[PDB]
Design a protein around this ligand. Structure first.
Ligand SMILES: Nc1ncnc2c1ncn2[C@@H]1O[C@H](COP(=O)(O)OP(=O)(O)OP(=O)(O)O)[C@@H](O)[C@H]1O
Ligand SMILES: Nc1ncnc2c1ncn2[C@@H]1O[C@H](COP(=O)(O)OP(=O)(O)OP(=O)(O)O)[C@@H](O)[C@H]1O
Ligand SMILES: Nc1ncnc2c1ncn2[C@@H]1O[C@H](COP(=O)(O)OP(=O)(O)OP(=O)(O)O)[C@@H](O)[C@H]1O
Ligand SMILES: [Mg+2]
Ligand SMILES: [Mg+2]
Lengths: 557, 121, 477
């Protein structure tokens, strides 16, 4: 059984939206964009505690009641022979499926307003065909979707007392025969027969009552006891009080609702939790089988540190409120480096424009230039992402399916391949052509003599890089159409083309490109520590550094 | 404040909000009155341990193990989850119970204070 | 003008606590370590709406109610005729100050239990000496401390209502409270807020003059991306509640890389053991080894922090004053001088010696032919690095006592000492250690794609990689 699609019409800020789903869904976006209104459309469809109150005037799109509300959810039932949840669906809907091998199912909600009653009635329907939905049968306050679906909604403002009290009807309310301790319960009854006849002390409260003449599990309070202490403090913080409510919901799902399909709707679970608790909750969400079906909304990148097999939904605004979805899987070739890509990508999911750089020296130089030119660039949605040199396909498909603008600045490298001398491999052009979906180019042979070694070998490789960059001019223009900025040789040669007079003045050398590349990280800090305001604007206004102008989002260039 | 105690009687309040103060006023009874309930205080601990072997029915003892085993799958924290109730037994009979509760608390606690009743409707 | 100290002698989860403060205090820690209880100790001292209800049984340490709750706050008051808030205090204190001690001030709170009315009475005292503290004079429900300090306590569709409440609170603090000293007490401002708004609130919190005095409790690293001239308080997660303070400043030499420093350390402040590595290749190799061996290292308090082109002092001073264990794994280098040939400075050894508290060593020079050179210049510099590591031995043992792990040549020769037959199997070359130096970001990924189980255990159980065993923290004793 699998969730496939949801389609929301005329409900709150959604006019007409269509979102593909999965079993594990993570919703993220800006403020006042409709992440809570997306989760309340699932509450009105599947949870019976909200559906019995109906719709108000404020649940309609721009507050007018002439348009109907229609929410349709699509399920896939193609694994009936192996999954038990599919049989839990089919054993309740035993008359409405049409074909003999119907693998789809549709659960719909329609709502039309009544102006005299000022009431919005909710009518639910199910079936296998979209044009032949029948009404759900029901008797009284119970219809037939409540025998299949249990919806657990976890708000950010949980109260442990309230939850425990409301659920105390399920636990502690069973007969269970005898439990081999009935004489202990007889000793409970016998020691209450020596307290009700002699409560008078020395006849001071028996004489006060003279002048005017069993199931005690209702007020039981759960506490959290640290080991080594015996006291019972009623005041506890909101970190463990959240996680005990999560444990009580997990116990009630694993015990009382084994016959049903349990759907979690979790709004913002990072609130009043530590960083390591967010990483532990992320591992329990995306690895274990406790949360088989959840819809998650969040504001924290630390809950996405362990994500795999996940539908990521991003709610944003270009002209209207629109949600972009992406199915996220880490491949078998990235299985050894999965945690580093997850820790890199989980912060770049919350941005608008992401520049993909190739190392930390680029981050030092670009953070200096954007510190001196546009210092509120990350307030406005900019981000700098360290790829690691190899991973251009995964980040660009994950950010491009979500509507996030990806910007690539990279070099033109030559790789010395394994076992052969004199034949080198095109690397940066092969990565940028694999970004376009084309075949990798063939390897080239560079004739370097054995007596030529040192700076002249680097000069011959730089002249070969200039020749290869001159050969593929139409491919370089096709990269520049899709925001890919391939350098000619390196970053430092493009930096020497902009501020090379100041680079000769600071470093006090005739070759400041080679002195920057002798030690890449420590000399970049030395260049950053002696730059000026005019040199940062000379970097930023240049032709070869248009990725920073694409990152700041202005129309200056 | 050392001389005057004002008891405000309104029928809109129930017995529960005075009874939550009475949960510590039972402890004020057991400590006070120059240990007049000290004859009962060794066997009011017998009634306190009546509330100790309500913790060994298996519907509570299963909850005390399974909630801790569900809690210790996150970080294996050094916690424990315990349960306690601490109840006691005794819109017109609740009010006539609360009148005798206020008269009983005025007879026991406030022998050193001047008690003023403000009985509204 | 300035806060100096708070001495919580007794409260709920504090048995004896003395914390040096400043203006712009930020308190962080784990879950249930009394970060809130610290902010209620400022509410019981300064705010009147919390102080009007008294103390219960539960506000005492381990429900004792036989000891005295005492909270003492120290004010600096060193300057005059420049600061307006100092005149706002001097005006109300009147004759409670003494000339001999006219540049210190104390506000104290005492509470002793009644055990008959079951109530805890709060008596406030102010004075210029810690002995002979006299009581605050008061007329009705108002004492004279309420004519000085105004305390704004903040605790939070959604998102924009919290920013609108910030605009309402800042407008009321700008309008109605010109004549008062305003103290903001913010409880977790990352709740229901986007991370761009967290960076914007951090910039407004640490750069604008509208938040002159705050105590900020937080769980988020994105509210510490702009931190400068602040005080950091960490509540330790031990069996005795220890609070540690650090005066955070960013110097004039580090002002061009301030952004990177702050961002990186802001996530490393919320850890317990931090391993300081050099680059991303160490991050690739150590994330592969710590995924294959101990994958819950991030749950238990471990962190990997890449520090590049910096002399280690800022990170070690910030994490050492807050009580966070720092482990440094590094390699020694020979950096050539600008405008000079044949003279190399000993960069990694000078970094470790400046961390230990010594001075920089002299610049070594070499008589290498230079005219004839090549790959063999790297083996000549490796032989010189082996002679440098052979000559300085007791300094290497002094670094080893202070959890600094200096390599002999590099990380890669230490990797070749452990799994070098596997590196000969994968790379199929006569020099696998020379092959990974040609492209570090590509060949480390190519290496960790081909290792498996019992190579990562041979890396982890080796004696040249004891920093991973310090980061995991599984002690034998
Ligand atoms: N009936 C409606 N018609 C049109 N717009 C509406 C309607 N109801 C709500 N909205 C819009 O939705 C916004 C609230 O969205 P919501 O609370 O779901 O945001 P959110 O993304 O969950 O926010 P946050 O993450 O900041 O808590 C309102 O500010 C308003 O702009
Ligand atoms: N399920 C039940 N089974 C048995 N007895 C019950 C049940 N529910 C309520 N009662 C009894 O009925 C009583 C309800 O009293 P009720 O409020 O109907 O009286 P009343 O005449 O309206 O009161 P008053 O004059 O004080 O306003 C309870 O106090 C209890 O004794
Ligand atoms: N009177 C007291 N004596 C001893 N310990 C106490 C007392 N009152 C509270 N505590 C303890 O102090 C802690 C209270 O948690 P608190 O809210 O102060 O922590 P926190 O770090 O702010 O938590 P959170 O991360 O959940 O916001 C608990 O461990 C509680 O047992
Ligand atoms: Mg919301
Ligand atoms: Mg707290």
């Amino acid at each position: 059984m699998k969730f496939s699609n949801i389609t929301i019409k005329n409900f709150r800020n959604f006019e007409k939206v269509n979102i593909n789903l999965d079993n594990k869904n993570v919703i993220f976006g800006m403020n006042d964009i409709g992440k809570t209104n997306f989760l309340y459309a699932l509450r009105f469809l599947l949870d019976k505690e909200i559906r019995k109150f109906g719709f108000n005037k404020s649940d309609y799109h721009k507050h007018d009641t002439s348009k109907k509300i229609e929410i349709i959810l699509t399920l896939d039932l193609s694994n009936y022979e192996k999954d038990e949840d599919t049989k839990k669906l089919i054993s309740v809907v035993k008359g409405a499926r049409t074909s003999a091998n119907a693998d789809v199912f549709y659960i719909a909600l329609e709502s039309k307003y009544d102006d005299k009653e000022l009431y919005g009635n909710i009518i639910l329907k199910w079936g296998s065909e979209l044009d032949n939905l029948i009404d759900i049968p029901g008797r009284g306050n119970i219809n037939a979707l409540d025998n299949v679906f249990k919806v657990i909604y976890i708000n950010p403002l949980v109260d442990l007392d309230k939850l425990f009290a409301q659920n105390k009807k399920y636990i502690f309310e069973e007969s269970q025969g005898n439990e081999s301790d009935e004489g202990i319960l007889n000793n409970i009854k016998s020691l209450t027969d020596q307290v009700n006849q002699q409560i008078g002390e020395m006849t001071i409260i028996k004489g006060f009552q003279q002048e005017i003449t069993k199931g005690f599990f209702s007020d039981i309070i759960p506490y959290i006891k640290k080991d080594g202490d015996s006291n019972y403090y009623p005041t506890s913080g909101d970190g463990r009080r959240k996680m005990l409510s999560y444990s009580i919901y997990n116990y009630l799902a694993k015990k009382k609702y084994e016959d049903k399909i349990v759907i979690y709707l979790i709004e913002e679970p990072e609130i009043s939790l530590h960083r390591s608790m967010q990483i532990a909750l992320s591992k329990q969400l995306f690895e274990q089988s406790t949360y088989k079906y959840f819809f998650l909304s969040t504001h924290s990148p630390e809950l996405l540190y362990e994500m795999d097999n996940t539908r990521l939904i991003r709610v944003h605004s270009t002209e209207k409120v629109v949600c972009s979805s992406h199915m996220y899987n880490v491949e078998e070739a990235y299985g050894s480096v999965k945690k580093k890509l997850n820790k890199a990508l989980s912060s770049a999911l919350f941005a608008e424009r992401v520049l993909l750089i190739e190392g930390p020296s680029e981050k030092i130089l670009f953070e200096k230039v954007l510190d001196e030119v546009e210092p509120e660039y990350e307030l406005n949605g900019g981000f700098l992402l360290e790829v690691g040199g190899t991973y251009f396909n995964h980040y660009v498909c994950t950010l491009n399916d979500l509507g996030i603008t990806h910007i690539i600045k990279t070099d033109n490298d030559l790789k010395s391949k394994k076992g052969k001398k004199g034949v080198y491999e095109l690397l940066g052009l092969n990565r940028c052509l694999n970004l376009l979906g084309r075949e990798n180019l063939d390897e080239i042979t560079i004739d370097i003599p054995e007596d030529i070694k040192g700076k002249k070998k680097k000069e011959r490789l730089n002249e070969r890089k200039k020749e290869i960059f001159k050969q593929y001019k139409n491919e370089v223009g096709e990269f520049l159409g899709e925001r890919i900025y391939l350098s000619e040789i390196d970053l430092e040669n493009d930096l020497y083309s902009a501020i090379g007079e100041s680079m000769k003045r600071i470093f006090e050398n005739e070759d400041p490109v080679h002195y920057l590349q002798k030690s890449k990280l420590f000399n970049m800090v030395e260049l950053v520590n002696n730059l000026s305001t005019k040199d940062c604007f000379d970097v930023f206004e240049h032709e070869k550094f248009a990725c920073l102008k694409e990152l700041v989002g202005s129309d200056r260039g | 404040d050392n001389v005057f105690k004002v008891i405000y009687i309104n029928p809109l309040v129930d017995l529960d909000k005075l009874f939550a103060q009475n949960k510590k006023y039972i402890f004020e009874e057991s400590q006070g009155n120059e240990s007049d309930e000290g004859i009962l205080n060794n066997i009011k601990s017998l009634t306190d341990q009546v509330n100790q072997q309500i913790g060994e029915m298996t519907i509570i003892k299963g909850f005390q193990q399974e909630i801790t085993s569900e809690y210790r799958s996150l970080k294996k924290e050094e916690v424990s989850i315990e349960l306690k109730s601490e109840m006691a037994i005794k819109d017109g009979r609740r009010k006539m119970l609360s009148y005798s509760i206020y008269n009983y608390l005025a007879k026991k606690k406030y022998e050193d204070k001047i008690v003023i009743y403000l009985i509204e409707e």
